[PDB]
Amino acid sequence: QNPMRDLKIEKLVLNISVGESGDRLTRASKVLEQLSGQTPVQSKARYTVRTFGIRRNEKIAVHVTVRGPKAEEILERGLKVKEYQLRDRNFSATGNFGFGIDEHIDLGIKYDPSIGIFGMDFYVVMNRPGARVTRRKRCKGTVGNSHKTTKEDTVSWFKQKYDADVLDK
Amino acid sequence: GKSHGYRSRTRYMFQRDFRKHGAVHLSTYLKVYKVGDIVDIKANGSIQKGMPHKFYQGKTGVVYNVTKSSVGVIINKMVGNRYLEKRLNLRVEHIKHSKCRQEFLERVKANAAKRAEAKAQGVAVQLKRQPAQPRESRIVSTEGNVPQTLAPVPYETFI
Amino acid sequence: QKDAKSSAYSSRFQTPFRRRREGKTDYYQRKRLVTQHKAKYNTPKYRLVVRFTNKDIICQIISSTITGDVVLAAAYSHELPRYGITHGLTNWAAAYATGLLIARRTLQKLGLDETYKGVEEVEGEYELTEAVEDGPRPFKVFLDIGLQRTTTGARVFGALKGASDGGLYVPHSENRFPGWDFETEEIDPELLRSYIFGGHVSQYMEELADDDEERFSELFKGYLADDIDADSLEDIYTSAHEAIRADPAFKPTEKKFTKEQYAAESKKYRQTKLSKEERAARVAAKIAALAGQQ
Amino acid sequence: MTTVSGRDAFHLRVRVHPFHVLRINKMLLQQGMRGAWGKPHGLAARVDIGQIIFSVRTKDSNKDVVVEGLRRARYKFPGQQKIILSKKWGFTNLDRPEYLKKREAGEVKDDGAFVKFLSKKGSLENNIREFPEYFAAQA
Amino acid sequence: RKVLQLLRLTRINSGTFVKVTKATLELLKLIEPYVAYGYPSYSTIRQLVYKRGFGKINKQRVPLSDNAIIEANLGKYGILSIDDLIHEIITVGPHFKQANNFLWPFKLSNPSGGWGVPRKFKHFIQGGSFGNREEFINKLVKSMN
RNA sequence: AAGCUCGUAUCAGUUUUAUGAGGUAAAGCGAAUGAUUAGAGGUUCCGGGGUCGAAAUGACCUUGACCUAUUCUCAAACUUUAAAUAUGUAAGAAGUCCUUGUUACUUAAUUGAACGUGGACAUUUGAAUGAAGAGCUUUUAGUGGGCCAUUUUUGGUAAGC
RNA sequence: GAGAACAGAAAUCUCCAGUAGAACAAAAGGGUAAAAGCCCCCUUGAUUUUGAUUUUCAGUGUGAAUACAAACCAUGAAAGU
RNA sequence: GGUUGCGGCCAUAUCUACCAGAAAGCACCGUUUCCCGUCCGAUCAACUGUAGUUAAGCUGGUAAGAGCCUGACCGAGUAGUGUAGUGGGUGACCAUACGCGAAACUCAGGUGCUGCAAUCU
Ligand SMILES: [Mg+2]
Ligand SMILES: [Mg+2]
Ligand SMILES: [Mg+2]
Ligand SMILES: [Mg+2]
Ligand SMILES: [Mg+2]
Ligand SMILES: [Mg+2]
Ligand SMILES: [Mg+2]
Ligand SMILES: [Mg+2]
Ligand SMILES: [Mg+2]
Ligand SMILES: [Mg+2]
Ligand SMILES: [Mg+2]
Ligand SMILES: [Mg+2]
Ligand SMILES: [Mg+2]
Ligand SMILES: [Mg+2]
Ligand SMILES: [Mg+2]
Ligand SMILES: [Mg+2]
Ligand SMILES: [Mg+2]
Ligand SMILES: [Mg+2]
Ligand SMILES: [Mg+2]
Ligand SMILES: [Mg+2]
Ligand SMILES: [Mg+2]
Ligand SMILES: [Mg+2]
Ligand SMILES: [Mg+2]
Ligand SMILES: [Mg+2]
Ligand SMILES: [Mg+2]
Ligand SMILES: [Mg+2]
Ligand SMILES: [Mg+2]
Ligand SMILES: [Mg+2]
């Protein structure tokens, strides 16, 4: 029925798709460091694309992954910025959901003009207890059909705490 | 020009069996081989080392040597008007006990035994195989089996 | 999920070996532990299988046969109450004890137990059990870690240490025992001994005791109940070795009910399936149900 | 076919596809029989004995008109081709008695020009949705 | 060609006895276009052996003109008359190998009265000569003997 | 051509029995790859052109693309299946069984592995058929343009090519 | 496939399906999924001696390759390789 | 009979959906002093067996279920093929004689078996 299997954040992934290498990317990364309190990880370009100005294996973007109580606090901050309203897109078929903010100063965070202003993606993935089953080395398995996150279930979860609005369809 | 590399012509020969690609099961590594054993050679193309050249695919010889990872095999190959004696160093993945030497040994035992019970009864034996013999008279009955008579059938198109 | 598998996909699909499907056996490793030199004929390669469940430590000396693997002897941390240990039954110290027990146990049954003492001393210094002269070579065994990660300080090498100190020849190296310094490229045997007797659990018990009566009380509910004070962990383990060396022989559980009695209940909670005729009836019924549009 | 009986009174099907490529060597002094492998010249269908070339479906009314299409058609092909009329309902299969027993039973569902046959094999559920007519009170 | 020789048939119209079993039946199949064969009667065997029986004795081909000759080579298996020989042939039986081999290949003439067909090299079933003509071998051999 | 060593033997352009190897013929294509005719249904909530309030970030369109279940037809360099003919090995005295000797190899281990002593078992001693004797050595001639027929088969329209 | 500010067909981030439809210098064929592919850690077995063996064969050479013996090393907890 | 560890064969074992599971086991599951590894104690390491739960895993049942397996005078003695003729036919090709013999099709049945060691109302 419902005892164990509650439903929760697996992780929060803050992503700043910077777009270039050098000072600006090192500057953005500092935003994620000074926010996640972790040290962030940098992504390289999969391939060259002239009209975006990036070369393959050039570091274009930074992200950082957060878990447990701290990720839940940063999530809240974001929601605040969008005045507790997301859209019925936003939520994946497989139970996760996300949103983005422009200017990160909109959630705590002073200004330090040597840092500047960055917008950012927010992706939060939902699971239940027992995900370990699909993540562990020995006897890796798949989570049962009942169990396992869905757009319906997690939209309703999210409305129900957060006291929030989904929107549109 | 023409082309005769070592694995020339081997596309279907060294291929793995349908839905049987991948790791080779441990039985293969647990067989024991002795000098004088009779093995059948058959390449496993997933193991490129210790591999029989394709002339020896499907051929059976005698073990003449045993090594960390291979047996040496003696094959008699015909070149010209004469067999030459050939020795091969095959890894074990490519070799398999000859099953007919097994029936044979089994029968040699069976034979010794048949001989024993015969002597310890003091009777004649008869130990060698006869081939399939003609067939002795029978009486077939007709009780429930009155012969059904058939005739040839007219041509007809089914298209 | 509309990710449906075409009947062609399934039809050409080749399944992994069973134990591969079920995530238990690494076959690349198994080939290399098991396979014997061809000119050592039927000399068994023997593995020291060590596994951990969430509550038990399994220790098995196993060998191979086309018709299946064959165990020479086995020992389980669950046995350890017999010899004085009643808690931390999956901790490093128990891993060590279990490796000791299996060692003394098999080479008891091998005759080899008096010749090849082991260490008896124990300061956890790096040493293999080396062969007598003009006598039997020691009984040799190769660690099978299964799917466990080789981390420097892993429980699994505790079982290796107990079994090596037990008098088995189990080839190994220091660099995964706790106490190995990667900068130093040395092994501080002080640290390793500490683990053998549970030092890391013991020091924690004290720190927690002094810094959190409450959490100390849950994590060590047991020790509290048994009046086991912390700085007597070493005795427990030290005295446990004594016991184990004193008497490694296997005594099997005392066994209420017989294999038969077990059978007649124990999965006559087993669903029994239908005969091709009952199935037909179900078929014919289902239609009469379903027939008529909507 | 079309003028005698109408743009619509039949369905004609060319049952043979010209997959085989013919070559011409092709001589342009002259080179020789040196290197004579040809270039592609044309396509052909490799046809067998008793292998069908054309098929036509019409109404029984139109038999004679139809045969004359296929009789007029022979004069365009090398070889001996026979005009056989078939026991078989149109292009399906099943001799008309066995096709009819079926259609008067609900076992036949009209697909795109051709047709779908009720099986006793899949899931009970969706064979019931596929062939409602087959299991229904109905007349 | 090999089979013809292993059955001792290396000359036209020469003939021998074969014991039928599977290992010999597949020989007769391989050879069928080149031979005519069947089931000989006692009569036919009696007369083949009386008229054209010769034995093999240090290679040499020797006419069976006294029972002493048969006993001297076949005595060791029972078989000490020409009728002992015929009997081991017609009943097959235990020394058939050795008895039959002692008999040289029979050298028949062309059939007196002819082959009775316009063409020998088709099967008996197809209008004649070659293959197993069964009982009708007696009539053919009698005219050849 | 010269012989030599032996003498019923192990032989064999053959069968049988047993046990292997093979991917051609055929077959297949609502089975993988590749090709190919036709509709049918459903998708696009993420390619597009309209008409409906220019309206459209909204409907019903026909048109692609794609998906599902069907449909007609194919492969020397495609295939799950898979012949016939051809093809490897075996059918014992250099064998079998019992006892227990040697070693520096090998094993936890006189444990294995090899090679042996001593003891036992010869009527069919281990299918068939044949054997015009089997085995062996030296030396040397000519030849080293080939062509034809059935069948398989490649190039070529074809050819007494 | 379903999801996430600027973000677009195409940037980065989740999740699901996924028998290999990928990758493995190169032609093609074979082979491979806790790998033979991808990321990382340690390395010089691409070394020393000289024999046997398989293909091509005259059973010469050459190229290539296989399994041992005797050294000296690498790696790994180890069996091993 | 259940369950676990190590297996043999490697779908009758896989796939999809829905049920059901006593006891023990197994699991999920609590913790972060310690050895150890992460962007992230998620994985990997360690610690308790203590606070909890059969939800999942796992085991078994259901299904005119997809697949896989097996059988059959199901198709078919068909296709193809070894051998034969101074057989037919202008030819393409075909028939007969002595043999060998498929695949698809159809229908029926089936959906892991098992070795070692331990443990269990
Ligand atoms: Mg499979
Ligand atoms: Mg404890
Ligand atoms: Mg560790
Ligand atoms: Mg018990
Ligand atoms: Mg002729
Ligand atoms: Mg005949
Ligand atoms: Mg099959
Ligand atoms: Mg049991
Ligand atoms: Mg078995
Ligand atoms: Mg910690
Ligand atoms: Mg951590
Ligand atoms: Mg955890
Ligand atoms: Mg762990
Ligand atoms: Mg589980
Ligand atoms: Mg499990
Ligand atoms: Mg289940
Ligand atoms: Mg089914
Ligand atoms: Mg023919
Ligand atoms: Mg012919
Ligand atoms: Mg005529
Ligand atoms: Mg002809
Ligand atoms: Mg024919
Ligand atoms: Mg025909
Ligand atoms: Mg016959
Ligand atoms: Mg078959
Ligand atoms: Mg069955
Ligand atoms: Mg076993
Ligand atoms: Mg056990």
Side-chain angles (χ1 to χ4, degrees), chain A residues 26-43:
Chain A
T26 138
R27 254 166 33 230
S29 132
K30 224 125 232 190
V31 165
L32 298 190
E33 199 190 28
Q34 191 183 302
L35 160 58
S36 66
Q38 305 190 4
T39 125
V41 35
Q42 293 179 352
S43 285

PDB file of all heavy atoms in Angstrom, chain A residues 26-43:
ATOM      1  N   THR A  26      35.088  30.009 -15.059  1.00  0.00           N
ATOM      2  CA  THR A  26      35.619  29.869 -13.717  1.00  0.00           C
ATOM      3  C   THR A  26      34.822  30.740 -12.758  1.00  0.00           C
ATOM      4  O   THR A  26      34.682  30.418 -11.577  1.00  0.00           O
ATOM      5  CB  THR A  26      37.180  30.060 -13.601  1.00  0.00           C
ATOM      6  OG1 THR A  26      37.488  30.834 -12.441  1.00  0.00           O
ATOM      7  CG2 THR A  26      37.787  30.735 -14.806  1.00  0.00           C
ATOM      8  N   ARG A  27      34.258  31.820 -13.280  1.00  0.00           N
ATOM      9  CA  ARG A  27      33.459  32.723 -12.459  1.00  0.00           C
ATOM     10  C   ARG A  27      32.145  32.041 -12.101  1.00  0.00           C
ATOM     11  O   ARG A  27      31.714  32.094 -10.959  1.00  0.00           O
ATOM     12  CB  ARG A  27      33.197  34.048 -13.196  1.00  0.00           C
ATOM     13  CG  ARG A  27      34.003  35.282 -12.706  1.00  0.00           C
ATOM     14  CD  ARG A  27      33.937  36.467 -13.700  1.00  0.00           C
ATOM     15  NE  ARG A  27      32.662  36.563 -14.423  1.00  0.00           N
ATOM     16  CZ  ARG A  27      32.539  36.683 -15.757  1.00  0.00           C
ATOM     17  NH1 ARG A  27      33.629  36.733 -16.535  1.00  0.00           N
ATOM     18  NH2 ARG A  27      31.319  36.765 -16.325  1.00  0.00           N
ATOM     19  N   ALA A  28      31.522  31.390 -13.082  1.00  0.00           N
ATOM     20  CA  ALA A  28      30.235  30.741 -12.855  1.00  0.00           C
ATOM     21  C   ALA A  28      30.382  29.594 -11.879  1.00  0.00           C
ATOM     22  O   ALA A  28      29.554  29.386 -10.998  1.00  0.00           O
ATOM     23  CB  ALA A  28      29.667  30.241 -14.143  1.00  0.00           C
ATOM     24  N   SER A  29      31.443  28.831 -12.061  1.00  0.00           N
ATOM     25  CA  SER A  29      31.701  27.700 -11.197  1.00  0.00           C
ATOM     26  C   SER A  29      31.761  28.132  -9.727  1.00  0.00           C
ATOM     27  O   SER A  29      31.213  27.462  -8.847  1.00  0.00           O
ATOM     28  CB  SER A  29      32.994  27.005 -11.650  1.00  0.00           C
ATOM     29  OG  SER A  29      33.858  26.767 -10.550  1.00  0.00           O
ATOM     30  N   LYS A  30      32.412  29.270  -9.481  1.00  0.00           N
ATOM     31  CA  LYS A  30      32.486  29.870  -8.150  1.00  0.00           C
ATOM     32  C   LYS A  30      31.086  30.036  -7.558  1.00  0.00           C
ATOM     33  O   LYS A  30      30.888  29.851  -6.371  1.00  0.00           O
ATOM     34  CB  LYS A  30      33.199  31.223  -8.232  1.00  0.00           C
ATOM     35  CG  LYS A  30      34.238  31.508  -7.158  1.00  0.00           C
ATOM     36  CD  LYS A  30      35.622  31.887  -7.787  1.00  0.00           C
ATOM     37  CE  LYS A  30      36.786  30.994  -7.187  1.00  0.00           C
ATOM     38  NZ  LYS A  30      38.215  31.378  -7.504  1.00  0.00           N
ATOM     39  N   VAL A  31      30.112  30.377  -8.396  1.00  0.00           N
ATOM     40  CA  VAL A  31      28.732  30.491  -7.951  1.00  0.00           C
ATOM     41  C   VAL A  31      28.267  29.159  -7.391  1.00  0.00           C
ATOM     42  O   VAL A  31      27.748  29.109  -6.290  1.00  0.00           O
ATOM     43  CB  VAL A  31      27.776  31.014  -9.068  1.00  0.00           C
ATOM     44  CG1 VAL A  31      26.307  30.787  -8.719  1.00  0.00           C
ATOM     45  CG2 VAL A  31      28.029  32.483  -9.345  1.00  0.00           C
ATOM     46  N   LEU A  32      28.487  28.077  -8.118  1.00  0.00           N
ATOM     47  CA  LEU A  32      28.087  26.767  -7.632  1.00  0.00           C
ATOM     48  C   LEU A  32      28.851  26.319  -6.384  1.00  0.00           C
ATOM     49  O   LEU A  32      28.270  25.680  -5.476  1.00  0.00           O
ATOM     50  CB  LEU A  32      28.205  25.726  -8.732  1.00  0.00           C
ATOM     51  CG  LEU A  32      27.266  26.095  -9.875  1.00  0.00           C
ATOM     52  CD1 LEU A  32      27.137  24.999 -10.883  1.00  0.00           C
ATOM     53  CD2 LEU A  32      25.925  26.415  -9.281  1.00  0.00           C
ATOM     54  N   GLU A  33      30.138  26.649  -6.309  1.00  0.00           N
ATOM     55  CA  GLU A  33      30.911  26.321  -5.113  1.00  0.00           C
ATOM     56  C   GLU A  33      30.309  27.019  -3.885  1.00  0.00           C
ATOM     57  O   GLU A  33      29.952  26.376  -2.906  1.00  0.00           O
ATOM     58  CB  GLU A  33      32.370  26.720  -5.301  1.00  0.00           C
ATOM     59  CG  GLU A  33      33.318  26.026  -4.352  1.00  0.00           C
ATOM     60  CD  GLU A  33      34.727  26.606  -4.400  1.00  0.00           C
ATOM     61  OE1 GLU A  33      34.841  27.826  -4.722  1.00  0.00           O
ATOM     62  OE2 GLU A  33      35.702  25.851  -4.106  1.00  0.00           O
ATOM     63  N   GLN A  34      30.143  28.332  -3.989  1.00  0.00           N
ATOM     64  CA  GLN A  34      29.722  29.206  -2.893  1.00  0.00           C
ATOM     65  C   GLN A  34      28.234  29.034  -2.552  1.00  0.00           C
ATOM     66  O   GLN A  34      27.631  29.848  -1.851  1.00  0.00           O
ATOM     67  CB  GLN A  34      30.034  30.656  -3.316  1.00  0.00           C
ATOM     68  CG  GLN A  34      29.935  31.799  -2.275  1.00  0.00           C
ATOM     69  CD  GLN A  34      30.200  33.176  -2.913  1.00  0.00           C
ATOM     70  OE1 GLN A  34      31.270  33.415  -3.492  1.00  0.00           O
ATOM     71  NE2 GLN A  34      29.215  34.071  -2.828  1.00  0.00           N
ATOM     72  N   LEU A  35      27.641  27.963  -3.048  1.00  0.00           N
ATOM     73  CA  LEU A  35      26.191  27.807  -2.976  1.00  0.00           C
ATOM     74  C   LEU A  35      25.884  26.395  -2.587  1.00  0.00           C
ATOM     75  O   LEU A  35      25.017  26.137  -1.774  1.00  0.00           O
ATOM     76  CB  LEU A  35      25.513  28.108  -4.328  1.00  0.00           C
ATOM     77  CG  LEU A  35      24.095  27.534  -4.502  1.00  0.00           C
ATOM     78  CD1 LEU A  35      23.109  27.995  -3.446  1.00  0.00           C
ATOM     79  CD2 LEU A  35      23.534  27.831  -5.843  1.00  0.00           C
ATOM     80  N   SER A  36      26.568  25.474  -3.221  1.00  0.00           N
ATOM     81  CA  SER A  36      26.394  24.097  -2.871  1.00  0.00           C
ATOM     82  C   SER A  36      27.293  23.767  -1.679  1.00  0.00           C
ATOM     83  O   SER A  36      27.087  22.763  -1.018  1.00  0.00           O
ATOM     84  CB  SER A  36      26.799  23.227  -4.044  1.00  0.00           C
ATOM     85  OG  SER A  36      28.191  23.360  -4.266  1.00  0.00           O
ATOM     86  N   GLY A  37      28.310  24.586  -1.421  1.00  0.00           N
ATOM     87  CA  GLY A  37      29.318  24.236  -0.435  1.00  0.00           C
ATOM     88  C   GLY A  37      30.127  23.002  -0.815  1.00  0.00           C
ATOM     89  O   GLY A  37      30.894  22.469  -0.005  1.00  0.00           O
ATOM     90  N   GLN A  38      29.939  22.534  -2.046  1.00  0.00           N
ATOM     91  CA  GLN A  38      30.725  21.438  -2.588  1.00  0.00           C
ATOM     92  C   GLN A  38      31.654  22.000  -3.661  1.00  0.00           C
ATOM     93  O   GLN A  38      31.701  23.208  -3.857  1.00  0.00           O
ATOM     94  CB  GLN A  38      29.808  20.402  -3.199  1.00  0.00           C
ATOM     95  CG  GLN A  38      28.748  19.885  -2.260  1.00  0.00           C
ATOM     96  CD  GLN A  38      28.056  18.716  -2.879  1.00  0.00           C
ATOM     97  OE1 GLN A  38      28.444  18.273  -3.977  1.00  0.00           O
ATOM     98  NE2 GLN A  38      27.032  18.192  -2.200  1.00  0.00           N
ATOM     99  N   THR A  39      32.404  21.162  -4.364  1.00  0.00           N
ATOM    100  CA  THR A  39      33.272  21.733  -5.377  1.00  0.00           C
ATOM    101  C   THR A  39      32.749  21.247  -6.729  1.00  0.00           C
ATOM    102  O   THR A  39      32.475  20.075  -6.886  1.00  0.00           O
ATOM    103  CB  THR A  39      34.794  21.473  -5.063  1.00  0.00           C
ATOM    104  OG1 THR A  39      35.419  20.834  -6.164  1.00  0.00           O
ATOM    105  CG2 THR A  39      34.965  20.604  -3.860  1.00  0.00           C
ATOM    106  N   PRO A  40      32.530  22.149  -7.695  1.00  0.00           N
ATOM    107  CA  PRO A  40      31.699  21.708  -8.827  1.00  0.00           C
ATOM    108  C   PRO A  40      32.477  21.018  -9.930  1.00  0.00           C
ATOM    109  O   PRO A  40      33.696  21.036  -9.883  1.00  0.00           O
ATOM    110  CB  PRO A  40      31.096  23.015  -9.339  1.00  0.00           C
ATOM    111  CG  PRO A  40      32.129  24.034  -9.047  1.00  0.00           C
ATOM    112  CD  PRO A  40      32.819  23.591  -7.753  1.00  0.00           C
ATOM    113  N   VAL A  41      31.789  20.412 -10.898  1.00  0.00           N
ATOM    114  CA  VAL A  41      32.466  19.610 -11.921  1.00  0.00           C
ATOM    115  C   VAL A  41      32.205  20.232 -13.250  1.00  0.00           C
ATOM    116  O   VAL A  41      31.107  20.692 -13.477  1.00  0.00           O
ATOM    117  CB  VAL A  41      32.043  18.091 -11.933  1.00  0.00           C
ATOM    118  CG1 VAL A  41      30.573  17.904 -11.583  1.00  0.00           C
ATOM    119  CG2 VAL A  41      32.391  17.434 -13.248  1.00  0.00           C
ATOM    120  N   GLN A  42      33.221  20.249 -14.109  1.00  0.00           N
ATOM    121  CA  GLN A  42      33.174  20.916 -15.394  1.00  0.00           C
ATOM    122  C   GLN A  42      32.996  19.953 -16.566  1.00  0.00           C
ATOM    123  O   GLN A  42      33.609  18.879 -16.601  1.00  0.00           O
ATOM    124  CB  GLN A  42      34.432  21.724 -15.573  1.00  0.00           C
ATOM    125  CG  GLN A  42      34.472  22.846 -14.600  1.00  0.00           C
ATOM    126  CD  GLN A  42      35.730  23.672 -14.717  1.00  0.00           C
ATOM    127  OE1 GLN A  42      36.669  23.307 -15.452  1.00  0.00           O
ATOM    128  NE2 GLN A  42      35.763  24.801 -13.985  1.00  0.00           N
ATOM    129  N   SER A  43      32.145  20.362 -17.515  1.00  0.00           N
ATOM    130  CA  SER A  43      31.777  19.577 -18.682  1.00  0.00           C
ATOM    131  C   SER A  43      32.533  20.070 -19.893  1.00  0.00           C
ATOM    132  O   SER A  43      32.673  21.260 -20.066  1.00  0.00           O
ATOM    133  CB  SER A  43      30.286  19.740 -18.955  1.00  0.00           C
ATOM    134  OG  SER A  43      29.485  18.998 -18.041  1.00  0.00           O
TER     135      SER A  43
END
